[PDB]
Every structure is written in C-alpha cells, then in structure tokens.
Design a protein around this ligand. Structure first.
Ligand SMILES: NC(=O)C1=CN([C@@H]2O[C@H](COP(=O)(O)OP(=O)(O)OC[C@H]3O[C@@H](n4cnc5c(N)ncnc54)[C@H](OP(=O)(O)O)[C@@H]3O)[C@@H](O)[C@H]2O)C=CC1
Ligand SMILES: Nc1nc(N)c2c(Sc3ccc(Cl)cc3)cccc2n1
Ligand SMILES: [Ca+2]
Ligand SMILES: [Ca+2]
Ligand SMILES: [Ca+2]
Length: 159
C-alpha cells in the first residue's frame, strides 16, 4: 500500500526555503522507524535537500528531467514511481508539498507528526478531507530538554 509520512507545524506548514525550521529529534526517530527497509518516494527538491540517499531504503526520485545521480532510482511520473517499487507491503511517500498532493488520492495511510510550533512556511501538507480518514494511533508528547515543542504522532487510515 501507499503511505504518506510528514511533519506538520501550525497551519499544515511542512517547510520553508527547502529545510524544516524546528529541531525535533523524536520526530527524526519516528521517521526512521516507520521508513526503514521500505522504498521511499520523493520529489527532486526533497532529494537535493537531503544530499545523500537514505540508507537501508530504496530511494525513488520524481523529476520530469533525466536523472543526475546513479545512487538513486529516477522516475518521470507518479505511476512510474509506484511501478519502480515492485511488490512490497508498503510504499513511503516522504515529500515534499507537490509530491504529497499527487500521492494523497492513491494513499491508504498517513503518518502525521503534528508539531505545536508557529512557523513561517512556503510549503504546506495537502488539505485532506478529515471524514475520509480514521485516526487509528495518536500519541501526544510534551516538550522536553531534547524537543523544543510538544508533538503528536498520528496514524490515519482511509475509511
Ligand atoms: O517541497 P516542494 O517544493 O513541493 O518540492 P518537492 O520535493 O515536492 O519536489 C517537486 C519536484 O519533483 C518533481 N516532480 C514532482 N511531481 C512530479 C511528477 N508527477 N512527474 C515528474 N516529476 C515530478 C519535479 O522536479 P522537476 O522540476 O525536475 O520536474 C518537481 O519540481
Ligand atoms: N516525521 C517526519 N516526516 C518526514 N517526512 C521527515 C523527513 S524527510 C521529509 C521532510 C518534509 C517533507 Cl514534505 C517530506 C519529507 C526528514 C526528517 C524528519 C522527518 N520527520
Ligand atoms: Ca542498511
Ligand atoms: Ca480521494
Ligand atoms: Ca511550541
């Protein structure tokens, strides 16, 4: 199945100038745990910001243009990105904004980190219909010495 995984601050803001503003190591550990040993699909902008492939995951990059790095799998359409994953139990869509938008209708699961942070952003997570999704997991955490914001990991499944 297709899943999207994203970290959302106030107003569904996901990014600004191709970087996540906030410092949330607990979200980095949640992201790693839910993505490890699964193919990851990302947009070209997200690919450039990471610099190196995510290890122990097949890295699929969405770009209209020819690929510029042989360490990753390059595709030119949503359907090509899915087909390049082959037969796997779950496909992780990691962003960014435009990629989330396109994969949302095809997705069965959403792994959302809701961050209680006011951030200026130029990129937002899609405006998903809440009636279409069922929250099956929801774990709130207060801010601590390592995480400067309170945050909630949520798992939603398409009804
Ligand atoms: O974060 P945000 O700023 O949203 O950036 P993203 O990380 O979502 O990257 C978006 C980029 O990925 C590529 N892309 C996205 N969707 C498709 C598609 N359906 N077919 C081909 N290429 C696609 C394009 O690269 P490119 O500009 O190379 O087409 C686009 O500019
Ligand atoms: N919970 C969560 N979700 C992601 N998708 C993460 C990523 S990669 C990424 C960032 C923004 C967007 Cl839109 C997509 C992927 C990196 C580091 C931590 C991340 N944490
Ligand atoms: Ca490995
Ligand atoms: Ca739909
Ligand atoms: Ca805060």
């Amino acid at each position: 199945m297709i899943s999207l995984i994203a970290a959302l601050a106030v107003d569904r803001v996901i990014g600004m100038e191709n970087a996540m503003p906030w410092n949330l190591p607990a979200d980095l550990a949640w992201f790693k745990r839910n993505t490890l040993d699964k193919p990851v699909i990302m947009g070209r902008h997200t690919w450039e910001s990471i610099g190196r492939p995510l290890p122990g995951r097949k890295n699929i990059i969405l770009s209209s243009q020819p690929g510029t790095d042989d360490r990753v799998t390059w595709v030119k359409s949503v359907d090509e990105a899915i087909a390049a994953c082959g037969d796997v139990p779950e496909i992780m869509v990691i962003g960014g904004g435009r990629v989330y938008e396109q994969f949302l209708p095809k997705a069965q699961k959403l792994y959302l980190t809701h961050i209680d942070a006011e951030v200026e952003g130029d990129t937002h997570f899609p405006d998903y219909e809440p009636d279409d999704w069922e929250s099956v997991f929801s774990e709130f955490h207060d801010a601590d010495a390592q995480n400067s914001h309170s945050y909630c990991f949520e798992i939603l499944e398409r009804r």
